[PDB]
């Protein structure tokens, strides 16, 4: 119980190695064993990570559960959590058992499917626990490998193109960040994230090529990290990989792609860009505001034009991340708390919606909106669940969707009214595409022979959704469960950002 | 010595080359490119070398660093034999 973060990080990876070695047979019993072994492993990781959650002390804004060991090439293996990153660990471990349970009907290469998800979980958890600069980059980039194969092997008809675009687009943005990490390593003489959080990187302007670089070295380091996190988030206009990868991935892949991997971009902004490059962040605030405002309006209108149900959900995520980006760079307590809440909240809602798509994809094997209609007539439970998360997706008060949206909008209002006015229009636009999709798929008359015999959600499918409905309602009604944890850490973060602004 | 050694070696070696020319003689002996561009690169390379040799001067330390200074009273072949097999014995064996 002194290496708790290392256990939850590498336990899923170790289980995959054992499964790959000592699990034999390709029959259904052999596959049935793999599903159970994965489910027990993901459940174990979630339970152990609850010890972190409840022993965590929100008042302490330092890193807790810290473990440090020597490593290679003069680096250190250091892990830990604070009020900004603890909840992203629990979100990852929370979605993984539900994601496994939703694949229970997959019959194609099951053992390999389970291994890819078990390996992916360990690497996703490492991103949020790592306190070494290179160690963060290792988990940040290693996650591309299992996801590249998850899309390639189990994806749709365009999965070859989607998997390559996903990997290379993300890979391109992070290699620039790698060089910035090497530069910070050389200036500060350390890769320790706690030590880099107090280091003062130079901000005096200089000239590079034909332009002045406002912010000096901080701006150059800021732009390298921005390229990595902007693509990961994703921000507009570097988002066009997401409508491919999220759509062409298998349903389980889409859940983890949207619920967890997107949060690495926003967490990157909260861990590095604002603490380590405050002067550059202050300078970039106007541009980030309008890119995020454009993203909300742009992708909301693009979602309204989609003929493919899974693409509506994919484009919805880009709009929801636009709020997160604005909240982070408003750099006030209200905006940053809203940004973190919006990230966690979007994990439950977006994941649930991709599971709603899978429920009817499994039965009908199509994603065209026009291929459905009046499903409420045969699928009462599905229409209720799909409606609930449709309403959460439009930020209805009472669901967790509202809180994150509301606070990021109010934090931005304090800084820029034009941005807040444009971003706030998302409430009108989100309702438009979200309700139209729900109506066209679920409501109406059952007038197609194909849908005549469609079945309702099975008991297993209902039980996957119940935890997600619980978190959405609980956090919507009692968000203090989140802000108590993140409150003190955001307060310290916002204070350092202010104390670093040029005077 | 290297003047005479060079003739001795390449008289035999060039004759061997003649043997392979007639062994693999082409079937079109009776009637046996980008030459313009090639001549331009050759002229450029030759000009660069000529410019470098225009200002040639050895290092002012070159005299003091000689491993095998030449002796006027010793004949060339004897001088080479005094260094070839003792100072350069490692290279001799590698040859």
């Amino acid at each position: 119980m002194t290496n708790l973060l290392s256990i939850i990080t590498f336990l899923p990876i170790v289980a995959a190695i054992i499964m790959a070695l000592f699990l034999r047979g390709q029959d259904e019993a052999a596959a049935r064993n793999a599903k159970w072994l994965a489910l027990l492993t993901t459940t174990a990781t979630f339970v152990i990570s609850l010890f972190v959650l409840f022993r965590f002390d929100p008042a302490n804004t330092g890193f807790q559960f810290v473990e440090d060991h020597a490593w290679i090439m003069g680096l250190r293996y250091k892990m830990g959590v604070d009020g900004i990153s603890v909840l992203f660990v629990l979100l990852t471990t929370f979605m993984m058992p539900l994601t496994i349970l939703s694949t229970w009907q997959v019959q194609d290469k099951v053992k390999e499917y389970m291994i890819a998800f078990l390996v992916l979980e360990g690497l996703m958890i490492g991103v949020f626990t790592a306190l070494d600069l290179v160690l963060f980059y290792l988990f940040f980039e290693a996650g591309l490998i299992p996801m590249f194969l998850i899309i390639g092997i189990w994806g749709g008809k365009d999965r070859i193109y989607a998997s390559f675009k996903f990997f290379l687009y993300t890979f391109l943005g992070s290699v620039l960040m790698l060089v910035a990490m090497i530069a910070m390593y050389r200036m500060a003489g350390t890769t320790d994230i706690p030590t880099l959080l107090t280091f003062d990187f130079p901000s005096e302007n200089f000239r590079l090529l034909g332009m002045t670089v406002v912010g000096g070295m901080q701006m150059l380091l800021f732009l390298a990290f921005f390229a990595s996190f902007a693509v990961k988030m994703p921000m507009w206009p570097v988002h066009t990989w997401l409508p491919d990868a999220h759509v062409q991935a298998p349903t389980a892949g889409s859940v983890l792609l949207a619920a967890v991997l997107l949060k690495m971009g926003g967490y990157g902004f909260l861990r590095f860009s604002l603490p380590m490059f405050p002067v550059a962040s202050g300078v970039a605030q106007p541009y980030v505001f309008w890119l995020s405002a454009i993203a909300i309006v742009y992708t909301s209108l693009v979602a309204l034009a989609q003929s493919d149900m899974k693409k509506v959900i994919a484009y919805s995520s880009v709009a929801h991340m636009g709020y997160v980006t604005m909240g982070v760079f408003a750099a006030n307590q209200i905006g940053v708390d809203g940004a973190i809440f919006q990230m966690l909240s979007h994990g439950f809602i977006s994941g649930a919606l991709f599971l709603c798509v899978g429920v009817i994809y499994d039965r009908m094997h199509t994603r065209e909106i026009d291929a459905y209609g009046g499903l409420v007539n045969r699928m009462p439970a599905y229409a209720a669940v799909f409606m609930f998360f449709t309403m959460a997706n439009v930020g209805l008060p009472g669901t967790s969707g509202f809180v994150g949206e509301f606070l990021t909008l109010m934090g931005v209002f304090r800084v820029d009214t034009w941005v807040a006015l444009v971003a706030t229009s998302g409430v009108i636009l989100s309702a438009a595409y979200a309700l139209w999709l729900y109506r066209r798929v679920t409501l109406g008359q059952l007038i197609k022979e194909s849908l005549k015999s469609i079945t309702d959600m099975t008991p297993r499918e209902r039980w996957v959704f119940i935890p997600l409905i619980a978190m959405t309602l609980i956090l919507g009604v009692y968000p203090r469960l989140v802000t108590d944890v993140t409150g003190p850490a955001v307060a310290a973060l916002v204070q350092d950002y202010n104390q670093s602004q040029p005077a | 010595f290297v003047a005479m050694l060079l003739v001795v070696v390449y008289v035999g070696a060039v004759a061997v080359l003649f043997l392979f020319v007639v062994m693999m003689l082409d079937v079109d002996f009776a009637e046996l490119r980008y030459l313009p561009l090639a001549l331009v690169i050759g002229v450029v390379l030759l000009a660069q070398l000529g410019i470098a040799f225009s200002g040639w001067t050895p290092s002012d330390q070159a005299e003091s660093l000689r491993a095998a200074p030449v002796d006027a009273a010793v004949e060339n072949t004897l001088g080479l034999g005094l260094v070839l097999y003792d100072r350069y014995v490692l290279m001799f064996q590698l040859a």
């Binding site: 290379l168 | 090639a38 690169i41 660069q48």
Partner: protein, 50 residues
């Protein structure tokens, strides 16, 4: 259109140029080596003796 134009239009076009230059002719490969030395010598000359 831009991303695909670069990733799938431009880089493959540079690949085809590289494949073409690898002609398989020994005299071309020697020409490349001679161009490399001549170019590097031009570079050294501009910096001068110093």
């Amino acid at each position: 259109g831009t991303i695909n134009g670069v990733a799938m239009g431009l880089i493959p076009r540079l690949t085809r140029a590289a494949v073409r230059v690898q002609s398989g002719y020994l005299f071309h490969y020697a020409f490349a080596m001679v161009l490399g030395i001549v170019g590097l010598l031009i570079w050294v000359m501009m910096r001068g003796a110093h």
